[PDB]
């Protein structure tokens, strides 16, 4: 509720009014402090969601994502204070302002009690990210990249706007509790499909499914490090949160209309993971891997099965923490080599031995190696999907088989092998990069002991 | 460059015997068959028709490409062998050692002092050895990858650093 | 047909610098100069005890290195496991489920005392 919001927004005057060089320090202090307070919100009751007021409420689904976003907030500050050191204090302050303003919106939307209120800051997250990708992005095609990312989501979000207000004029309020209790069987009338399509496509776009995913490779690669993590670790997941919330009034229409997306997602994950097997760009390879994992959640959410929701929430968080880490891996390597081609800097393990380890559990976590939370996600989803149909395991398991090859492919090409002779600027890794990397992996294994925290309201 | 015929025959002679060794295995057979294999080689040494010599080496390796042992014998250190770049993962470039923390550098004072001499030597030698390069570079770029030595006294041969300071083949 | 004299000289110096460089890759009797190392009361006591060198010292050296290895790696871990098993795991039902101890015809039990009946006489098969 408020105990998270005002501390987040009151953090903004601090960064603006802090000393010239202390900006990174005091921002990091209370961002971690905010994370601690958010963790206090992680508690949930049995069945009734933790409701605070007409404006804000939390459930067993929102809380794990809330603590994840606040937990993220220190990490971009940690990950960004290397390529922004040679910048004017105002621009550094502006950069920090963008992140916490972005993070502030995330707390708002996840705790939003009204769908329209959920909707207003659903796209409002775009404005800070658009600035981050465009201004501080370090590339040339970032301009076209920002346009692709911006227009795709709007093209899907605006139908939701017309759909959402239609609910208000037809079924009174759009309070999440009032929708759930007063749910009615959506008919099969040919208007209700376009009703169904509008209420779904908005979350489809910013949850890249095959076909509606070309923004993500352009979104991730040209975005700066902080932009890439926030976009891949939370931003691809507003779509996820919407579906678990909005599919309450899409049944039984979801039963019949689910087919085109399920085939698109299940086949897409094989295709996308195949792209990972032959990606020339390390950041792009990680980006395409996010599509495969996210497309798995598409099948998870859209099956509408108790087990499927549970594994979704497991992959909901685990992928986000993992994808942020892998982007950190690529970023921590990038500036040393000043290039994105994977084969540019081979045999890094012989030069940097600890990064060899950090890359190693990172690849293992993305492998869904048990008992990592990723395995709990994928394995739960497979069982739910298998109950839905026996055939899907052929597609399901094949993804894990492909996921194995490309995951260690980056490991062998970069970490193992012969070091590149020509390069000589690879310095011993700063303990900031090392500290940040453990900041990611350590909570992941810490979460393994308590899956019930992140299983969700279906748990 | 020009893979002239005599080197090809020597290529044929050397590699075929290695394959023949992989076949006979036993030393007496290997020695016995090598001599007859040798004997059938030098007996046709009088051919003013080099084209005929080429024709004699059409069926030559074709029989070899049939007669080749599917698992030839290679010492492990060579390509394909079991110990191929086995100790590569240990060898690390010397320039990475410049990164070493001063306390680590203090652990090896005199050797690091010797590094300073090498760093000093390679500095002025570079300009000297590069200067020798342009003044004797053949026109139209380098024609052969072979690198000319240090003509005058005192100066080191050009581009000597990486070859000389190459990590040893058994680094541990 | 054997190197040309210039490249023969090139390999000559390349050899010579390599020998000097390989010579320069050595160590020294003092090297490596490690710093002072923190020591505790117990170890140098063992050092001065073992300085005599005769087998009387070493036989009980191995047993002591085996003693404290037994206590802090076998004795302690089994202690906490038993406490965990006896008062936490077994405190919950159906956590440590045995098999019924197989009982045979003519074998008595101690819980209720009686001996279950013997087997009935075989049809006398002999080889």
């Amino acid at each position: 509720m408020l105990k998270i919001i005002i501390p987040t927004t009151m953090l903004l005057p601090m960064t603006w009014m802090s000393k010239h060089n202390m900006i990174w320090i005091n921002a990091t202090v209370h961002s971690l402090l905010i994370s601690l307070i958010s963790l206090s919100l992680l508690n949930q009751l049995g069945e009734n969601s933790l409701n605070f007021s007409l404006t804000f409420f939390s459930d067993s689904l929102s809380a794990p994502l809330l603590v994840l976003t606040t937990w993220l907030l220190p990490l971009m500050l940690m990950a960004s204070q290397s390529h922004l050191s040679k910048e004017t204090t105002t621009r550094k302050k502006l950069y920090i302002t963008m992140l916490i303003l972005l993070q502030l919106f995330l707390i708002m939307t996840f705790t939003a009690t009204e769908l329209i209120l959920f909707y207003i800051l659903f796209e409002a997250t775009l404005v800070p990210t658009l600035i981050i990708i465009t201004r501080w992005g370090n590339q040339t095609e970032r301009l076209n990249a920002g346009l692709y990312f911006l227009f795709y989501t709007l093209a899907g979000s605006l139908p939701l706007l017309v759909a959402l207000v239609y609910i208000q004029n037809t079924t009174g309020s759009l309070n999440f509790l009032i929708i759930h209790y007063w749910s009615h069987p959506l008919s099969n009338s040919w208007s209700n499909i376009f009703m169904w399509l509008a209420c779904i496509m908005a979350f489809m776009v910013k949850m890249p499914l095959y076909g509606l995913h070309l923004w993500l490779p352009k979104a991730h690669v040209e975005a700066p490090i902080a932009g890439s993590m926030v976009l891949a670790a939370v931003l691809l997941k507003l779509g996820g949160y919407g579906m678990m919330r909005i599919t309450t009034i899409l049944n039984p229409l979801t039963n019949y209309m689910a087919y085109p997306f399920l085939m698109l997602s299940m086949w897409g994950m094989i295709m996308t993971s195949s792209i990972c097997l032959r990606q020339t760009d390390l950041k792009s390879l990680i980006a395409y891997s996010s599509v495969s994992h996210m497309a798995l959640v598409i099948v998870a959410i859209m099956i509408q099965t108790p087990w499927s929701f549970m594994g979704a929430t497991a992959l909901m968080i685990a992928h986000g923490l993992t994808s942020s880490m892998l982007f950190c891996l690529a970023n921590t390597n990038y500036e040393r080599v000043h290039s994105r081609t994977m084969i540019l800097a081979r045999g890094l393990q012989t030069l940097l031995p600890l990064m060899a380890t950090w890359w190693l559990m990172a690849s293992l976590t993305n492998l869904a190696l048990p008992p990592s939370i990723n395995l709990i996600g994928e394995l739960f989803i497979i069982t739910a999907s298998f109950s839905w149909s026996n055939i899907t395991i052929i597609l399901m398991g094949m993804n894990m088989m492909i996921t194995a090859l490309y995951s260690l492919y980056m490991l062998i090409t970069t970490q193992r092998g012969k070091y590149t002779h020509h390069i000589n600027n690879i310095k011993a890794s700063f303990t900031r990069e090392n500290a940040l990397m453990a900041l990611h992996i350590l909570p992941l294994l810490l979460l393994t002991l308590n899956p019930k925290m992140i299983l969700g309201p279906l748990y | 460059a020009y893979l002239t015929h005599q080197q090809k025959v020597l290529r044929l002679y050397k590699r075929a015997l290695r394959h023949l060794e992989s076949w006979c295995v036993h030393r007496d057979k290997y020695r016995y068959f090598a001599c007859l294999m040798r004997a059938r080689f030098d007996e046709h040494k009088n051919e003013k028709d080099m084209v005929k010599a080429t024709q004699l080496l059409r069926q030559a390796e074709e029989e070899f490409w049939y007669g080749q042992h599917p698992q030839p014998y290679i010492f492990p250190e060579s390509p394909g062998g079991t110990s191929y770049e086995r100790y590569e993962c240990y060898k690390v470039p010397e320039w990475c050692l410049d990164d070493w923390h001063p306390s680590e550098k203090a652990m090896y004072p005199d050797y690091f002092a010797k590094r300073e001499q090498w760093k000093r030597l390679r500095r002025e030698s570079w300009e000297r050895e590069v200067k020798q390069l342009q003044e004797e570079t053949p026109p139209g770029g380098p024609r052969t990858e072979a690198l000319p030595p240090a003509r005058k006294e005192g100066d080191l041969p050009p581009l000597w650093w990486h070859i000389v300071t190459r990590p040893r083949e058994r680094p541990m | 047909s054997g190197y040309t004299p210039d490249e023969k000289l090139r390999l000559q110096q390349l050899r010579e610098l390599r020998r000097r460089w390989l010579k320069d890759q050595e160590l020294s009797p003092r090297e490596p100069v490690l710093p002072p190392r923190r020591v505790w009361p117990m170890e140098q006591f063992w050092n001065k005890f073992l300085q005599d060198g005769a087998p009387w010292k070493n036989v009980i050296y191995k047993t002591y290195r085996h003693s404290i290895f037994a206590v802090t790696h076998v004795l302690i871990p089994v202690w906490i496991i038993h406490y965990y098993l006896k008062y936490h795991v077994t405190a919950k039902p159906y956590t440590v489920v045995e098999r019924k101890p197989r009982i045979f015809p003519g074998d008595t039990i101690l819980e209720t005392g009686e001996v279950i009946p013997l087997m009935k006489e075989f049809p006398d098969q002999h080889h």
């Binding site: 012989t350 011993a428 090392n434 | 990475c96 990164d99 680590e104 990590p167 680094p171 | 890759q25 050595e26």
Partner: peptide, 12 residues
């Protein structure tokens, strides 16, 4: 004999 072994700095 004994000769210097090269190794990336593990101090950090």
């Amino acid at each position: 004999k004994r000769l210097f072994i090269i190794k990336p700095s593990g101090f950090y």
